[PDB]
């Protein structure tokens, strides 16, 4: 028996000769049985002599010394005499003995493995008079000090034993979609809930309820943790309320709630942690649960925005404007919303119509409470007294933007936002079921019956021949062409306008003018991508999901309908794609695929080609090869470790910075001051006691895990490598290339064209 206490300071020291023999003197001189039962469990059915000897519960290990008559110097102290030598009594005992501090500096005793982690058991059976030389007795313990687990085992021992520990009372299942539940609600089936035990102490009311069934089952009212591997940001650890329902061994939750999880329903699993103590149960629904972390502090705005179906339905309700539903299908949709019905805005729209029909934009007023004031100038929508009144060609006030109605509802009352987004989904789904969203073949055709596809083809074939002459003009901005751009008559001007294959061949090799031949095509293709609004009706199912910003954009429609565009990769070798890629362009000397040229160092190429065939007409076997060369960079998977090793070394640089009670930040090691005042934009001093650096390191981890890793060819490297090169400040790899800056701020601006003459 012993009283309880807490440790406060760990002290490291070299184990001296007195430090070994002071404890656990059990069977010191026994060379025949060096794995004796008095110090461990050698046999699988062994017994300790001086213990209770149960199955690895009473005995926590028993050490022992090894008496060696030979005197050997420890290898940790052997490096001191190699540096304590000089050309010069009293000076040989002062500078050489400070950290040992006049000790013996010799290994007389030696500790033994306690036979709990012993490869290592039958090694110390022959060091009772091993040899005569002082080298074979030093190597025999040098191999024993090197075959341990704390020797590079290494970091893999640390991050699997001390940093990451497996825990009980958990569950791991795949998740599916279910929009019938609430926001902070999940679903556990009966086969999992009938086995997971949750402890709770006895009370005076349920004394006849627990004894007729402490260890009870996972009933309703409890809360569990949710987690998706890997943890991207801070809001990926939401604790939601449990609700049992009969399901065939799969969990389910709201598909609009998967936006903090950043995962889809294509097979992703969900980790589940269950608490048992009351101190771990009350803290879950106070700081961790979904009704508390409603503010995404990485961005400073709303966290739970609209999903995929609800965004498209909220778009179509306010943009369609030509559906007049009567009072029969209006009172059915007034049950999912907690507000009453507005008066009918249309009493009689036609002499052949008798019943008062409602308005589509009047149906969207069943979600805003009475007293809601909201105005967005970019979409001209005005919400006056809980009823929106205007709408003109806007979709930015619905998704995660700058100013939207979700953030203005979270700033209004912040008490029933989870009861507003829930009714904005369970009513909009029933409304979209009455209309039906389907992608037919006419949506990929994007054209009329006859001659409208031919006009589109004859316009694409002329817009892809002008974007080539635009890019050909940009290659005349080379300093070797300074005599051509002058106001003077030339004789070799016809050789620079007739050669069309030569200007395509110059774009492949020498990748220093190929960065202005991609950005020129990307600026001449903006007048080509704008053809998807003149062609095709407004009821096309792609233009609905593209203008609302649900899935895709206008770039993912012109490749379906008109043309794929340009294809450029990072770096390739010994082959490049020519212009006019057909069957006839498969000759050796006149194409850069097989032979470079005839005249010539062209071993390395950077390919660039434009395809005029879309995903609907059909790709050529060469156009399906260009699309396999270019899109091969997005197929690798050996790059996910690079946003995993960045945020691991970035973590502890801010993970100890917290907020003290003095109004300033601190440092947990030496009580140092990082800064004197936190840089809060809001005037409310509510950030006190929380680790504001641990939510700032994940704020940079979330901008690195979701980084658009589509690299530019040769000038810019990557949006993640440019972040790492800024974050790596003190990593001085070398002084090979240093760039300066010379600002032209002087008296040259008073004269005419002073900056161009000064530069």
């Amino acid at each position: 028996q012993v009283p309880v206490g807490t440790l406060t300071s760990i002290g490291f020291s070299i184990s001296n000769n007195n430090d070994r023999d002071k404890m656990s003197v059990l069977e010191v001189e026994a060379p025949n049985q060096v794995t004796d039962s008095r110090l461990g469990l050698p046999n699988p059915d062994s017994v300790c002599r001086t213990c209770g000897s149960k199955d690895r519960k009473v005995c926590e290990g028993h050490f022992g010394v090894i008496n060696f008559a030979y005197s050997i110097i420890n290898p940790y102290f052997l490096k001191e005499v190699a540096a304590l030598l000089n050309k010069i009594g009293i000076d040989q005992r002062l500078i050489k003995k400070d950290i040992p501090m006049f000790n013996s500096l010799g290994l007389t005793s030696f500790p033994v493995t306690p036979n709990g982690y012993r490869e290592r058991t039958r090694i110390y059976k022959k060091l009772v008079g091993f040899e005569g030389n002082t080298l074979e007795l030093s190597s025999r313990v040098m191999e024993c000090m090197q075959y341990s687990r704390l020797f590079s085992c290494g970091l893999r021992f640390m991050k699997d034993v001390l940093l990451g520990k497996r825990s009980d009372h958990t569950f791991r299942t795949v998740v599916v979609g279910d929009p019938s539940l609430k926001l902070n609600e999940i679903g556990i089936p009966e086969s999992i809930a009938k086995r997971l035990q949750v402890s709770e102490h006895l009370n005076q009311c349920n004394k006849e309820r627990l004894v007729t069934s402490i260890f009870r089952s996972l009933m309703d009212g409890d809360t569990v943790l949710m987690n998706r591997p890997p943890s991207i940001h801070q809001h990926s650890l939401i604790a939601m309320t449990v609700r049992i329902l009969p399901t065939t061994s799969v969990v389910s939750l709201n598909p609009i709630c998967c936006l903090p999880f950043r995962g889809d329903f294509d097979g992703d699993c969900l980790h589940g942690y269950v608490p048992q103590s009351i101190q771990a149960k009350v803290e879950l629904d106070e700081l961790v649960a979904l009704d508390k972390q409603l503010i995404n502090r990485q961005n400073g705005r709303n966290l739970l925005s609209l999903g995929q179906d609800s965004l498209t339905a909220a778009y179509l309700v306010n943009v369609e404007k030509n559906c007049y539903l009567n009072r029969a299908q209006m009172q059915q949709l007034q049950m999912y919303c907690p507000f009453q019905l507005p008066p009918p805005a249309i009493i009689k729209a036609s002499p052949s119509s008798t019943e008062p029909q409602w308005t589509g934009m009047q149906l969207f007023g069943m979600l805003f409470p009475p007293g809601f004031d909201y105005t967005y100038p970019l979409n001209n929508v005005v919400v006056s007294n809980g009823e929106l009144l205007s709408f003109s060609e806007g979709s930015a006030w619905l998704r995660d933007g700058e100013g939207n109605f979700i953030e203005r509802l979270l700033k209004h009352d912040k008490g029933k936002v989870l009861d507003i987004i829930y009714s904005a989904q369970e009513m909009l789904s029933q409304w979209l079921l009455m209309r039906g969203l389907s992608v037919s073949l006419a949506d990929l055709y994007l054209s009329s019956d006859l001659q409208s596809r031919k006009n589109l083809t004859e316009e694409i074939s002329y817009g892809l021949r002008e974007a080539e002459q635009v890019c050909n003009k940009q290659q005349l901005m080379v300093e070797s062409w300074r005599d051509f751009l002058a106001v003077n008559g030339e004789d070799k001007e016809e050789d620079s306008v007739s050669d069309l294959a030569r200007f395509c061949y110059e774009r492949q090799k020498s990748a220093t003018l190929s960065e202005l031949a991609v950005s020129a095509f990307k600026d001449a293709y903006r007048d080509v991508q704008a053809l998807a609004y003149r062609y095709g009706d407004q009821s096309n199912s792609f233009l609905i999901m593209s203008k609302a910003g649900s899935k895709g954009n206008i770039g993912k429609l012109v490749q379906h309908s008109m043309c794929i565009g340009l294809q450029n990769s990072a770096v390739s070798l010994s082959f490049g794609f020519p212009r006019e890629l057909t069957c006839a362009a498969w000759n050796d000397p006149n194409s850069p695929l097989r032979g470079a040229k005839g005249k010539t160092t062209t071993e390395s190429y950077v390919p660039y080609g434009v395809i005029e065939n879309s995903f609907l007409t059909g790709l050529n076997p060469l156009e399906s090869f260009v699309h396999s060369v270019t899109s091969r960079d997005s197929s690798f998977s050996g790059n996910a470790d690079l946003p995993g090793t960045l945020s691991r070394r970035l973590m502890f640089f801010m993970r100890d910075i917290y907020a003290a009670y003095d109004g300033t930040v601190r440092n947990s090691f030496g009580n140092q001051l990082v800064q004197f005042t936190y840089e809060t934009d809001g005037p409310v001093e509510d950030i006190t006691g929380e680790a504001l650096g641990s939510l700032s390191a994940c704020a940079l981890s979330e901008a690195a895990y979701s980084a658009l890793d589509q690299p530019i060819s040769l000038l810019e490297t990557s949006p993640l490598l440019n972040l790492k090169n800024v974050l790596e400040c003190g990593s001085k790899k070398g002084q090979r290339e240093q760039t300066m800056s010379l600002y032209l701020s002087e008296y040259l601006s008073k004269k005419k064209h002073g900056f161009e003459y000064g530069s």
Partner: protein, 199 residues
């Protein structure tokens, strides 16, 4: 080309007075605000040596003065800089600034080891201060606090002398004002405050 050398020496004499004005050492208008032709038309242009030793004291006091040394020959050793060390001990001053053309010698660096306790003697090259460092936009203005103001600051924020953010002595701003180990400096931001303790 002696005109380029006279312009390079004019820039040093123009930035030194502007550094001492930011340090506040009672600079008259005869040396400050000098044109590019006034150094030729006023001073002796036929002087091919470093004859720019200027005596100047403080503003609020006249006991401690400052020596702006200009050695003639480069690569100053212990055999040549004896008179550059004897004058400060003969006229009993405690602060002096000397500039160099090339890099220093270790024999001269072993001379300021036991001599910096009484008379502080620091060095910085003239090949780097061709422009003004304090006039840059990226660096804000600083205010070196007095010991009568450093005592009331550590008792208000209840912070010790080692729990503050550190600034090195070899930094070109802490060496610009002639700061030693122990004093703090107030640094403002374009409108918050953040002090820094010199390590």
């Amino acid at each position: 080309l002696t005109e380029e050398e006279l312009k390079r020496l004019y820039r040093i004499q123009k930035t030194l007075m502007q550094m001492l004005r930011d340090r506040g050492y009672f600079i008259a208008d005869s040396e400050l605000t000098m044109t590019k032709q006034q150094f030729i038309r006023k001073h002796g242009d036929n002087m091919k040596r470093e004859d720019l030793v200027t005596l100047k004291a403080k503003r609020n006091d006249n006991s401690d003065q400052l020596y702006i040394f200009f050695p003639d020959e480069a690569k100053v050793g212990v055999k040549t800089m004896k008179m550059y060390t004897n004058r400060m001990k003969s006229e009993n001053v405690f602060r002096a600034i000397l500039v160099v053309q090339q890099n220093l010698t270790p024999f001269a660096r072993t001379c300021i080891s036991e001599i910096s306790s009484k008379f502080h003697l620091e060095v910085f090259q003239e090949a780097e201060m061709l422009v003004n460092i304090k006039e840059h936009v990226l660096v804000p203005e600083h205010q070196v606090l007095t010991t009568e103001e450093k005592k009331t600051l550590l008792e208000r924020y209840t912070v010790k002398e080692t729990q503050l953010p550190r600034i090195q002595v070899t930094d070109p701003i802490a060496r610009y004002f002639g700061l030693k180990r122990g004093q703090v400096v107030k640094i403002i931001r374009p409108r918050y405050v953040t002090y820094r303790y010199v390590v």
